Design a protein around this ligand. Structure first.
Ligand SMILES: Clc1ccc(C(c2ccc(Cl)cc2)[n+]2ccn(C[C@H](OCc3ccc(Cl)cc3Cl)c3ccc(Cl)cc3Cl)c2)cc1
Ligand SMILES: Clc1ccc(C(c2ccc(Cl)cc2)[n+]2ccn(C[C@H](OCc3ccc(Cl)cc3Cl)c3ccc(Cl)cc3Cl)c2)cc1
Ligand SMILES: [Ca+2]
Ligand SMILES: [Ca+2]
Ligand SMILES: [Ca+2]
Ligand SMILES: [Ca+2]
Length: 144
């Protein structure tokens, strides 16, 4: 386990934890999912959270979030949701996520990232070196 993998999980947690209180609620999960073209019901949001909510408190904290990711890395069923996430980042549908597309999507998600931070994200996910993130590279970024 490296500092960087922790920092990537932390970056992902803060994207869902909109108010920074340390827990992800159904409302925060719901607003992030709608920003990615989804429309989950109140019942689906509660069921999604209950699957990963180890205690009964109804919200996801940082350890639960990490356990959620470790289970999903062992269970290779969630390809569909990664494909659906790819569709939102790849705005023009050409098979590549450009830095401009990532910048636009992160700004939509209420994220104040510098242009260098956006570039860093593209470069870290980029495997072939073309300066863009194709589907295969997006999968590897999501699943490690
Ligand atoms: Cl060991 C390990 C470490 C990290 C990951 C993933 C990840 C993906 C989704 C979730 Cl819910 C949690 C973690 N990961 C890689 C990078 N980022 C930060 C990343 O941001 C970097 C990024 C790079 C390239 C591209 Cl094209 C998009 C993004 Cl968002 C990001 C990805 C997905 C979401 Cl929903 C939120 C975030 Cl902040 C997280 C997986 C395994
Ligand atoms: Cl943007 C996004 C975020 C997560 C996923 C997948 C996933 C699956 C395997 C691996 Cl190794 C990495 C990621 N995943 C992980 C967890 N959930 C369940 C649920 O996913 C909801 C979801 C579905 C589709 C899309 Cl496009 C986005 C989301 Cl957030 C969820 C996500 C985040 C939190 Cl904080 C809590 C939950 Cl319960 C899905 C796909 C797209
Ligand atoms: Ca919160
Ligand atoms: Ca909890
Ligand atoms: Ca594109
Ligand atoms: Ca590439």
């Amino acid at each position: 386990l490296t500092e960087e993998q922790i920092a990537e999980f932390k970056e992902a947690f803060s994207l869902f934890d909109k108010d920074g209180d340390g827990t992800i609620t159904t409302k925060e999960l719901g607003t992030v999912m709608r920003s990615l073209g989804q429309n989950p019901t109140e019942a689906e949001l509660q069921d999604m959270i209950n699957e990963v909510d180890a205690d009964g408190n109804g919200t996801i904290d940082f350890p639960e979030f990490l356990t959620m990711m470790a289970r999903k890395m062992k269970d290779t069923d969630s390809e569909e949701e990664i494909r659906e996430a790819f569709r939102v980042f790849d705005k023009d549908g050409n098979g590549y996520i450009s830095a401009a597309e990532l910048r636009h999507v992160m700004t939509n998600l209420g994220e104040k990232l510098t242009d260098e931070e956006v570039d860093e994200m593209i470069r870290e996910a980029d495997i072939d070196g073309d300066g863009q993130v194709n589907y295969e590279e997006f999968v590897q970024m999501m699943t490690a």
